[model samples]
Target: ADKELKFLVVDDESTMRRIVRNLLKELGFNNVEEAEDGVDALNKLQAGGYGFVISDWNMPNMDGLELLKTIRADGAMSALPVLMVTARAKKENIIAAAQAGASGYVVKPFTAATLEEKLNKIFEKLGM
Candidate 1:
């Protein structure tokens, strides 16, 4: 794995953000950033160099779905790998995220194993 491949963890909750950040560290990735919402996420992305994203669906200012769409629409980071990590478990939500160009999805209350699995799956799919 590329140890320097930057990762962005986006969630409105500070605890969730910290959890995701720690999980990434546990997975041997030290290059990670956190965002409070989709708007903040987008700003960080635009600042450049993020290779992957793990985002929560519900948030203030902007949501994960909207962030995903914006990323997909933007030429600079259109191919950036994004994993939706949220509490929304509806089939429609998953489908919508996929359509919006999320690379993977994981419902909340997820285990470390699940996050690892989904992250690996996305990396594999992208040949990263």
Candidate 2:
């Protein structure tokens, strides 16, 4: 792990974002940022320097799927890591997430241990 990898936790709820931020910090990634929705997410991403994203699926303006799809469309950032965090747990939606280029998936109510495993899973998968 780079440890310094800048992370953006994009969720409409502040409480949810905090959980991910705390877990990310516990994982030794202190450079974490938060955004209210996919719109805010892209605003900061467009400013550059973001290394990873963890987004929620139910935001109003540009949800997780749209965010991931948009990022994937940019050639320069095509491979930027994106981990989808959702509470839906619908199999079809999860499939769509993977198809949209999610680096990993974590259902809501995830534990610190679970977050670690999936985060590390993508880290290893990406050779980060």
Candidate 3:
């Protein structure tokens, strides 16, 4: 795995963002940033150098699904890895995220081990 890879964690709540950031740090990924919502996430992403995204489904300005769609449509960031981390556990939500080009989907309240597993699986699938 690329320890130097940069990641963006997007969520509406400061606590969730902080928790995710800390969790990623514990997982040995120190190069992580936070965004309050999808619009902010898009701005930072467009600034470049973000290799991965972990975003929540429900947010103000723009939602994770929209962000994922926009990322997929944008030529420059089309192939970027996007992991949807949200509390929306419905089957429809998962299918929708996959359809919107999410590289992985993880339900909220996820364990560190689960996050690690998903990250590794995505990296492997992408041949990173």
Sliding window of 10 residues with minimal summed lDDT for model 1: 119-128
| Residue 108 local lDDT, model 2 | 86
Q: What local lDDT score does residue 74 receive in model 2, on the 0 to 100 scale?
A: 90
Residue pairs clashing, model 3: none
Please give the range of 10 consecutive residues that has the lowest summed lDDT in model 2.
Answer: 108-117
Candidate number that wins on TM-score, 2 or 3? 2
Candidate 2 displacement at residue 121 in angstroms: 0.5
lDDT agreement with native, every candidate: 0.92, 0.92, 0.92
- lDDT, candidate 3, equals 0.92
Instruction: Determine the backbone clash count of candidate 1.
Output: 0
TM-score for each of the candidates: 0.97, 0.97, 0.96
